[PDB]
Amino acid sequence: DITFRNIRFRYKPDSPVILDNINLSIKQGEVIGIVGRSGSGKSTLTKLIQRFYIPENGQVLIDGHDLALADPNWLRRQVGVVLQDNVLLNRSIIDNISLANPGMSVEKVIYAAKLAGAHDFISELREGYNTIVGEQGAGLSGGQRQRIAIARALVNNPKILIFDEATSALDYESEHVIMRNMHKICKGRTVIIIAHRLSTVKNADRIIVMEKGKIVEQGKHKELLSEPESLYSYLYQLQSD
């Protein structure tokens, strides 16, 4: 259960307030989607759930524990973060996946790759998992590199997973391939999907619409879309006009 209590955030000491007084409570296992126009403030949630951003006021807490007092590694074992990662190291495919967990089991590498939906296209290259991804000869697709990353995050078994614009730089097809796995990737996890494309968050258990640092609307895709005058309905039309 992730919670934002009367959160207020600024980037620098005396700059504009980005998040006014956010209050949000994400239930365990809930797959929540967060959308909004430029300036909404959604681009600060990930770094706040991690503990990079420090709230000027209020508190962020996981499972009841205030993150300002939580242990760095504990917090790191709790949250898995997937950003738009289109850069790999010139190592094997498998070394790129276990980059953070050195001598981890090949069995777990495979298990993670499977969940991420990267196993098949991987065991399809010349040398498979041992294929040198040296950004020169072994050229993968953006959608594929993005999936290698989803693997890294899933290496550990994150009870909380955050996709922050993870697929915004991909075209419909590429993203689609990935959205097909989201069901199994979400199994037994609390998931936050922050995206630009409202369609990406279409089947979330609930969508949060942010605007100007504030939460203005929230509900299931269909509830929001049934209100023609809703901001969500406006944004939805825009990505299809």
UniProtKB/Swiss-Prot annotation:
Ranges for domain ABC transporter: 2-237
Taxonomic superkingdom: Bacteria
Annotated compartments: Cell inner membrane
Binding site for ATP: 36-43
Subunit structure of this chain's protein: Homodimer.
Stated family: Belongs to the ABC transporter superfamily. Protein-1 exporter (TC 3.A.1.109) family.
Task performed by this protein: Part of the ABC transporter complex HlyBD involved in hemolysin export. Transmembrane domains (TMD) form a pore in the inner membrane and the ATP-binding domain (NBD) is responsible for energy generation.
Miscellaneous remark of the record: The complex HlyBD-TolC (OMF) forms a single transport channel across the two membranes, allowing direct export of alpha-hemolysin. This channel is involved in type 1 secretion system.
Domain writeup: In HlyB the peptidase C39 domain, the ATP-binding domain (NBD) and the transmembrane domain (TMD) are fused.
Name used for this protein in its record: Alpha-hemolysin translocation ATP-binding protein HlyB
Organism placement in taxonomy: Bacteria, Pseudomonadati, Pseudomonadota, Gammaproteobacteria, Enterobacterales
Gene expressing this chain: hlyB
